[PDB]
Design a protein around this ligand. Structure first.
Ligand SMILES: [Zn+2]
Ligand SMILES: [Zn+2]
Ligand SMILES: [Zn+2]
Ligand SMILES: [Zn+2]
Lengths: 232, 232
């Protein structure tokens, strides 16, 4: 695990790294958020920003020093601060940014700055390739509402890795979330859709926990299931 | 205002009618649901099905008898029974059907049959015209999650009418109704988006009330304001 400033990096495969940023906040402590960095031939692809523009810049600085390839594009997984808080740093660096159209639509409402481009999805959940030009091994899937209405998901082709973002909870989590933009009705089915979209992923990377097995997916849907009846 | 089988039709403008149908529920008597019929030159456009296939067939029969123009297409406003229950009646009649891609994605989970085509929306909420061919005066807008994640909205060009579907409740409603699929965080902003998208609409048609003034929007948005709670 390479430390770089306030960011931590963990190689998950040749060509794939997890980036982790921390939001240092009173009462709680540091809240971790994870994203991905993927080397695809002669360029780098990033999934998710860090919490802040300055932390995101540090990712880019780490990429420069450790990998020394240019960053072609970033995909951002939904319109929350842990995923899109550093969009300005990506834009300032001349990186082409992508998000779900709905994520761009909601961005202003949240405190976020919108990605430059909007991804669109088929009825099957799969991204319309015309809207995701040159994503290389990044396979982008919209599993349905869950953690959020806009949440998207990313598989990394030629690896066992799939990224659930904040949709999939840890195999030992007890809660699905605190905020009313989680879709309690559909969550379980969204969790499962994700699993069905990347049936070969054995390593399941997520926003707030160390990578886990496919048990995270099962656990997350099960939770979602039991809760559906208890929400006031 | 006219009765035809177990449906009710109400002319709202030259060229525009409200269709009403009823589903007996155990919770209480007949529950009404409203949709639209629009004459555009030499063809008819339909917004929303009735609750059932049979009831939707009667809408077609009424169109035949009262307007006697062919039905070019139907747009459906979200994946719930009152809006999409009659999809099979539309497809058996050879009518081209459209829904939010998300509505089509969610359909199976919801007991619904998917539309034949998927609508896609820009970051600003307006429908991508390439996905909505020949919609004539139908101006389709996705205001953001509210009643449902997938709820869409329709303005009728050259009229004062805007259709909020189940997003908007009338200005005298005691509640926002069923919140099971609702996005409590974004609802108020989605309500307002709708209003901002059709700033000239003075007649606001909705799924479960008689047409109302713009006060319905304000009232809806304000009820929804009371749903956002800060969570520690
Ligand atoms: Zn989030
Ligand atoms: Zn998160
Ligand atoms: Zn509904
Ligand atoms: Zn309804």
């Amino acid at each position: 695990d390479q430390r770089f400033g306030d960011l931590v990096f963990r190689q998950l495969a040749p060509n794939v790294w997890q980036h982790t940023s921390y939001l240092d906040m009173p009462g709680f402590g540091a809240v971790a958020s994870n994203g991905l960095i993927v080397r695809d031939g002669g360029r780098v692809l990033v999934v998710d920003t860090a919490w802040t523009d300055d932390q995101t810049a540090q990712i880019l600085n780490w990429i420069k020093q450790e990998i020394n390839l240019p960053v072609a594009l970033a995909v951002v997984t939904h319109a929350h601060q842990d995923k899109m808080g550093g969009m300005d740093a990506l834009h300032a660096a001349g990186i082409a940014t992508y998000a779900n159209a709905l994520s761009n639509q909601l961005a202003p409402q949240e405190g976020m700055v919108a990605a430059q481009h909007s991804l669109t999805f088929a009825a099957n959940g799969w991204v319309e390739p015309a809207t995701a030009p040159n994503f290389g091994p990044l396979k982008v899937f919209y599993p349905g509402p869950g953690h959020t209405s806009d949440n998207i998901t990313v598989g990394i082709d030629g690896t066992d890795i799939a990224f659930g973002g904040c949709l999939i909870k840890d195999s030992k989590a007890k809660s699905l979330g605190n905020l009313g933009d989680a879709d309690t009705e559909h969550y379980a089915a969204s969790a499962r859709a994700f699993g069905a979209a990347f049936p070969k992923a054995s390593m399941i990377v997520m926003s707030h926990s160390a990578p886990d097995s496919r048990a995270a997916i099962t656990h997350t849907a099960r939770m979602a299931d039991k809760l559906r009846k208890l929400v006031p």
